[PDB]
From a paper:
The nucleocapsid core is formed by the encapsidation of RNA by CP which consists of two domains: the amino-terminal domain that is involved in RNA binding and the carboxyl-terminal domain that possesses protease activity. The E2 glycoprotein interacts with the nucleocapsid complex via a hydrophobic pocket present in the carboxyl-terminal region of the CP that leads to budding of alphaviruses. Alphavirus CP possesses cis-autoproteolytic activity for its cleavage from the rest of the structural polyprotein during the viral infection process. Here, we report the high-resolution crystal structures of the post-cleavage state of the AVCP and dioxane-bound AVCP at 1.81 Å and 1.98 Å resolution respectively.
Considering these facts, we expressed, purified and crystallized the C-terminal domain (residues 110–267) of AVCP for our studies. The structure of AVCP was refined to 1.81 Å resolution with Rcryst value of 17.6% and Rfree value of 23.1%. 152 out of 158 residues have well defined electron density while electron density was missing at the N-terminus for the first six residues (110–115) in AVCP. The overall fold of AVCP (C-terminal domain) consists of two β-barrel sub-domains similar to crystal structures of other alphavirus CPs. The sub-domains I and II consist of six and eight β-strands respectively, joined via a long linker loop region comprising of eighteen residues (Leu172-Glu189). As a conserved feature of all the members of serine protease family, AVCP contains a catalytic triad formed of His144, Ser218 and Asp166 residues. Once cleaved, the mature CP does not cleave other CPs further in trans due to the binding of the C-terminal Trp267 residue at the P1 position near the active site. AVCP appears to be monomeric both in the crystal structure as well as in solution as observed by size-exclusion chromatography. Particularly, AVCP does not possess any helix in the structure, whereas CPs of other alphaviruses possess a 310 and/or an α-helix. The apo form of AVCP crystal structure reveals the presence of hydrophobic pocket composed of conserved residues on the surface of CP, which has also been reported in both the crystal structures of SCP and SFCP.
Numbering used by the authors: 116 to 267
Write the structure that this text describes.
Amino acid sequence: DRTFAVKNEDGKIMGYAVAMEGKVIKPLHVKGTIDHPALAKLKFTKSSSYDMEFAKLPTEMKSDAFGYTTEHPEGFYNWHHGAVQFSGGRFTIPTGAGGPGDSGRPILDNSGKVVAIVLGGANEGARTALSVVTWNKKGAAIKTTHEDTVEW
């Protein structure tokens, strides 16, 4: 288990955190507490520019974390709600497959490596373009935001 619900005070799921490469990572805009004893009270470092916040992964969860890959060839990827196309530098889904509460969910390749973290979606009709965080080969974060993105 490397994906954790972020809960508001009522216990409603607001979005998700992931364990990846020695960090716990979540979208900054997802407000609540991670529903995990080892993770609730960690010290987070916030980056407004990338809509992300991160903490050091507790040494108990060392090995139970996703790997990340910069290999994103065009084609199809996976996430909790089904297929994610990557084409023309954009990740898209059928409109209606994602919405509020899906921020922080990872997009995975078939080997189970993370290629992106979902921030939200811009409704283009049949397709919805996902606003995401990715990392390049230098480990630099990249936020991709589409016109009229809806935060999830």
